[model samples]
Target: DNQTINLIQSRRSIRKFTTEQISDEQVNTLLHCAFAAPSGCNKQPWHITVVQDQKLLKEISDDTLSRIHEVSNVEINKNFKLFYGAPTVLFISYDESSSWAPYDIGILTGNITTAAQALGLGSCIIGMVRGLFTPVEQGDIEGLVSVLDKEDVKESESIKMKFDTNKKYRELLDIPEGYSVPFGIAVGIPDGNLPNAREVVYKVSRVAE
Candidate 1:
């Protein structure tokens, strides 16, 4: 009980990371822990592509920045490194046809971050890069997300990506056909020291009188 709570509370979202690459054994362990997460109907509808090559990482970072600037017209810093210099990045892609994918992905994310904390490594969950893989036609707004067409729900933060990258980045990132990379995690040695814990708020209700 105490171990789980403490591990979770201390697991900060680490953005700064060392340049040293994580070992293959540690990577394997992390993958196993990720696989241990429960899925809807045991579907386990996911696959992982870990990027350890520095050259590819740098290329991705640069490409994402250019897209943000040119396509989104967002102001950005000239020296921004998307993965925060973490030597290893894991892209968790999911089978988009499955509607429960988002929820399962969240559960798997918790397992990954918590396990990484246990393994003496730091991790940062990067969600903004989803545009690179999913390439939605509209803004990624909350509660008003883009939707897949020909459905009962329209423009209601739907579960599907506007357009799956398909063959766009499949060969480049080795993501299987019909899979989309929604988010990624950067893992590496912490450049050290924990950041101050943020406040927690609890809202609860009981129906026993």
Candidate 2:
């Protein structure tokens, strides 16, 4: 029970990362463990955009700044680096065609983060992408779907509204239609001690009645 206690208790959302190339072997191990995550009806539809190059990661990080405005209070000031200093970022998405694809993708993401922690690596999930991508015309992402064979989240009329108002952010990155931006996960060795490192300071343990 305590095997994970240290990991569970000490794990923190790392924002700054050292510039290092996380080995492909290690990356594969992380993916293997993450893919083992459960799925609804055993239907697992997860896709990833693995970013490793420092220059590319920087560009992606810069592109993400457009959405950084969504932050509030001190959180707003906490961001400038796209992935909070992660040497690599994974853009995780799901096939909108599946009813539970998003949920399944979420589970897989958790698996990746936890496994990364077990390996002495740290990670954080970024959930605000609306600040990064513009909501564009439904068909604009057609090319994106052509490669991924997936769609985004939005009804036709709703899609039109967002596209009309937010096309710039959408095209900033080459995302396709029918592919919903569930979120991204950054993985790396942190530059320093984990942020928010503290005890829960509360309790809720219970047994069945």
Candidate 3:
């Protein structure tokens, strides 16, 4: 009878994925769930860049894995690819100016991953891309926008306006002006066994008097 609780408790971080592609309808549904997440002042300052192209995904995966060794100070598994053969990846970014942007983006991302699970699709929020996002050297902003332009998710005009006018943001990673990449998730049909769900290890302490 505990449907929502079951969904939340059983969710797993799926790594191994099959080549079966995710449909656009499923992508739209996940995004819809993300946009529905709560945000401060209804600012909803988030943008999702969808990458479904296999070649581009491979490029990003290779670049991320290679750069992990070069820029990452913290040791991580060097041999693993970032996307893990997932057919679709969604990079979530938010307005840098917002004080609650990171928290807002976190909620949004949670919505995406949980929604994917609800739809019987597997997903993993890959963090390796953080170290990989550096400024581009040529046609930086233009090139980024061109790629992000392919992102099918609908965004507010204000976000688009900021990207169009902000010059400093031109050099940043595929992300646009006034926006920062917080995290990304890989989605596809799972190939192998999923990770075990984490147990509730911490005691809930309440001082509600």
Candidate 4:
């Protein structure tokens, strides 16, 4: 069980990371693992943007910090680097028209985080990407959040409106048209303690005939 299970069990959502960037070789290995995920219809309807640019990350973080509190009470220190200072971030966007796209992206996201652990990297999956798709009216494009693909859970479940980044934010990367970001990853060297197992916090059930 330790072979694969240990990797999964020991993995945690790391918040603090060293400023050192991960190598391109490690990044490609993680990407290959992500590509191996099973997809419905084999559509593989996902596009991932890997950001290692600290300048861009800082610009995005400052912008997001100011407005994020307006829509959410999630306490983030104004000085907090949304990427937690991780040197690499992954943004995963999926074809909006594909009904099964979310499932495939979810699988892809799992592969990335788990693979990072196997490669001796720490990964975090913080799910708040509202900054990228903030409405023109609700935002004025001054400050933004850190980089990562994210799921705006409340907005998607109830808001029932289109999502698109403002001109400056969207143009910063090559996230193609017609794809919406739903998840992302921040990967780097951990500068903190390895988090303990959290399996007990989640519920489990079993049934048999």
TM-score of each: 0.80, 0.67, 0.74, 0.78
Give a tens-digit lDDT track for model 1, residues 34-87: 999988878888888889888877767655544444444343442556788999
Ranking by TM-score: 1, 4, 3, 2
Model 1 poorest ten-residue lDDT run: 141-150
- Runs in model 2 lying further than 4 Å from the true structure: 67-79, 134-177, 193-197, 201-208
Clashes of 2: 12
Q: Alpha carbon lDDT of residue 55, candidate 2?
A: 71
Candidate 3 stretches with Cα past 4 Å from truth are: 72-80, 134-174, 192-195
Please write out the lDDT profile of model 2 over residues 113-195, one tens digit for every residue.
87888877888886544334443223323322233212322222111111221354234434555566766788988777666
lDDT of each: 0.72, 0.62, 0.68, 0.71
Candidate 4 has its poorest 10 consecutive residues by lDDT at 152-161
Error of 4 at 135 (Å): 5.5
Q: Pick the candidate with the highest TM-score.
A: 1
After TM-score superposition, the amount by which residue 190's alpha carbon in candidate 1 deviates from its true location, in angstroms, is 0.4
Better of 2 and 4 by TM-score: 4
| Candidate of highest lDDT | 1
TM-score attained by model 1: 0.80
